[PDB]
From a paper:
The purified hPBV RdRP (534 aa, ~62 kDa with a N-terminal 6xHis tag) exists in solution as a monomer, based on its gel filtration chromatography elution profile. hPBV RdRP was crystallized in the space group of P21 with two molecules in each asymmetric unit. The crystal structure was solved to 2.4 Å resolution by single-wavelength anomalous dispersion (SAD) using Se-Met derivatized crystals. In the final model of the hPBV RdRP, one molecule is comprised of residues 1–494, 500–511, and 518–534, while the other molecule contains residues 1–495 and 520–534. The polypeptide can be divided into three domains based on their function: an N-terminal domain (aa 1–84), a core polymerase domain (aa 85–470), and a C-terminal domain (aa 471–534). The palm subdomain hosts the three key aspartic acid residues, D261, D359, and D360, of the active site. The hPBV RdRP contains three channels leading to the active site of the protein that are believed to allow for dsRNA product export, template entry and NTP uptake. The hPBV RdRP possesses a highly flexible, 24-aa insertion loop structure (aa 495–518) formed by an internal sequence from the C-terminal domain. This loop structure, which is associated with higher than average temperature factor values, extends from the C-terminal domain towards the catalytic site. In this model, the 3’-end of the template collides with the hPBV insertion loop structure, suggesting that the insertion loop in its current position would sterically prevent the template from binding to the active site of the RdRP as expected in the assembly of a productive initiation complex (right). Therefore, the hPBV insertion loop structure must undergo a significant conformational change in order for RNA binding and replication to take place.
Picobirnaviruses (PBV) are small, non-enveloped dsRNA viruses infecting a wide range of mammalian and avian species. Human PBV (hPBV) has been identified on almost every continent, and has been associated with acute gastroenteritis primarily in children and people that are immunocompromised. It has a bi-segmented genome with the genome segment two (PBV2) encoding the viral RdRP and the genome segment one (PBV1) encoding the CP and a protein of unknown function. The hPBV RdRP possesses a canonical polymerase fold with a 24 amino acids (aa) long C-terminal insertion loop structure that partially occupies the active site of the polymerase. The polymerase domain, which is structurally highly conserved amongst RNA viruses, has a right-hand configuration with three subdomains: the fingers (aa 85–230, 268–324), palm (aa 231–267, 325–414), and thumb (aa 415–470).
Author numbering: 1 to 494, 500 to 511, 518 to 534
The structure:
């Protein structure tokens, strides 16, 4: 745990007033519930109770959509309540304790079937440090050692080299050696209506130099898979929709579709899972630098130290460091092996229109059952809870959207985001934006980007009308000139970038959003 000052200064550039104040907020927590001005003067309860009166009209035509809405309404509530560090210690422990559950290795044929999906593909080369830096988000925090904006410390960071030496992460940055540690970050996820129901997500904020080295492989990997369409959720929700359609149209007429969920996937992504990820990357990669990368950069996300408080560092191997540049790449490649393994364990072939993304999957194969899947997956040390699994021949959920074989828009089984979930996010934010300092245009833009998720909901027009009420300036209709200049307003403002890399949140194309078109047509 606690290190003397002369140790701490090898991890972080000292003095660091901003890092001191960051950890002070980590210790004390953040207890206030942040409510938006959406339906100001009505409670969260009445907002949902009123929308529900309209919503129930879908229950006769689409009862399982009503069940999906009713399940997500139970989660509506605050997302801004950050517990004090002393109440999150067990959340940290789970990263280190969950990786030693009983676990057996993956089947060879499953690993080969996964590698077959990219048979003809141009092998990946590492992207240079310089080009990798240019592409990445550079306004976000550099982590250890500077805890600054990335753009300000590029030249103190590259050229860099990072590797594990035992339990230490050694980092050489433009000639100087530092010791690397992830900084304990936080995200809130709604999990009920009380302040104490906020889910306390553990975010590992990686050293800039580690993220650069990681992304030298993961940026080319994401790019290649996007163009090949291998992981639809890295492309778009419409690409997800098209593969959901293919899945429903090619499954056995009497087969179920199984929707799997992992409890604490990152924490259980143990060494057995890691070596499958390393093997698959090695098949995608080519050249000597890649061999070097696979031995020295790849392991860091599963073993980097954690700075969880100003004087305090935890060491040891652990599960997926939630927040790594390859957070979703490693897990999605291995989750795909799990899907193949389940069909192969039962003497059949995975329906290739099955999908997965980090801890979320939907699959089918001849004769599939949920119980076979759960057994096949969880023998690898992976935790699953049944009442979060879902099984049906006609519908499924994936990436918090409902899909039905018969619910088609222009031929496609489009995904229906929950109006209840969207209402919770319209009323409740994770951060405070003082009205006096950020203004109504930004709040309105946050609203539009939430509502846009329900663009395929059968009650989307009634839902938009409901949301127009509840906004004083009516989602932009009441702001002079705003809708006519929506592209430009949207650029002053500045989830898919998330699904591809980091896993924290769980561009003038805004003019093509359904919700914008729908508002303009209401003038």
């Amino acid at each position: 745990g606690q290190v003397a000052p002369n140790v701490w200064s090898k991890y972080f550039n000292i003095p660091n007033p901003g890092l001191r104040a960051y950890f002070s907020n980590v210790v004390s927590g953040q207890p206030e519930v942040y409510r938006t001005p959406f339906y100001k003067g009505m409670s969260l309860e009445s907002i949902c109770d009123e929308w529900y009166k309209k919503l129930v009209s879908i229950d006769t035509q689409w009862p399982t959509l009503m069940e999906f809405e009713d399940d997500l309404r139970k989660k509506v509530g605050p997302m801004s309540v950050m517990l004090p560090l002393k109440e999150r210690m067990s959340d940290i422990d789970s990263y280190y304790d969950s990786i030693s559950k009983d676990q057996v290795p993956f089947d060879t044929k499953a690993i080969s079937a996964a590698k077959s999906e990219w048979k003809g593909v141009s092998r990946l080369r590492l992207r240079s440090e310089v080009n990798t830096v240019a592409v990445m988000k550079k306004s976000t925090n550099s982590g250890s050692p500077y805890f600054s904006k990335r753009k300000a410390v590029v030249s103190k960071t590259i050229p860099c080299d990072v590797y594990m030496d035992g339990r230490y992460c050694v980092m050489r940055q433009n000639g100087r050696e530092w010791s690397g540690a992830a900084v304990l970050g936080w995200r809130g996820q709604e999990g009920g209506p009380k302040p104490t129901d906020v889910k306390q997500r553990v975010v590992w904020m990686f050293p800039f130099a580690v993220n650069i080295r990681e992304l030298q492989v993961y940026q080319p990997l994401i790019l290649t898979f996007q163009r090949l369409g291998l992981v639809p959720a890295w492309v778009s929700m419409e690409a997800v929709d098209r593969r959901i359609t293919k899945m429903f149209d090619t499954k056995g007429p009497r087969d179920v579709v199984v929707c799997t969920d992992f409890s604490k996937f990152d924490q259980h992504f143990n060494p057995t899972c890691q070596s499958v990820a390393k093997e698959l990357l090695a098949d995608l990669l080519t050249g000597q630098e890649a061999v070097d990368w696979l031995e020295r950069v790849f392991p860091i996300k599963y073993a980097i130290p954690l700075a969880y408080n100003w004087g305090e560092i935890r060491y040891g191997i652990h599960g997926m460091g939630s927040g790594s540049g390859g957070t979703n790449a490693d897990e999605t490649l291995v989750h795909r092996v799990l899907q193949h393994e389940a069909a192969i364990s039962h003497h059949t072939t995975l329906n290739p229109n099955s999908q997965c993304l980090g801890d979320d999957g939907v699959l089918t194969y001849p004769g599939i059952s949920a119980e076979d899947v759960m057994q096949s997956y969880s023998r690898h040390g992976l935790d699953m809870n049944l009442e979060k699994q879902y099984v049906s021949k006609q519908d499924c959920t994936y990436l918090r959207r409902w899909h039905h074989t018969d619910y088609r828009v222009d031929g496609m089984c489009v995904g229906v985001y929950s109006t209840m979930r969207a209402l919770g996010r319209l009323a409740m934010q994770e951060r405070y934006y003082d009205p006096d300092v950020w203004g109504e245009k930004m709040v309105t833009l946050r609203y539009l980007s939430i509502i846009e998720n329900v663009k395929y909901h059968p009650l989307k027009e009634e839902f938009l009308d409901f949301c127009i009420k509840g906004d004083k300036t009516r989602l932009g209709l009441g702001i002079p000139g705003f809708l006519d200049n929506i592209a430009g307003e949207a650029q002053k403002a500045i989830f898919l970038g998330y699904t591809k890399s980091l896993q924290y949140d769980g561009a003038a194309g805004i003019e093509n959003w359904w919700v914008v078109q729908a508002l303009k047509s209401r003038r």
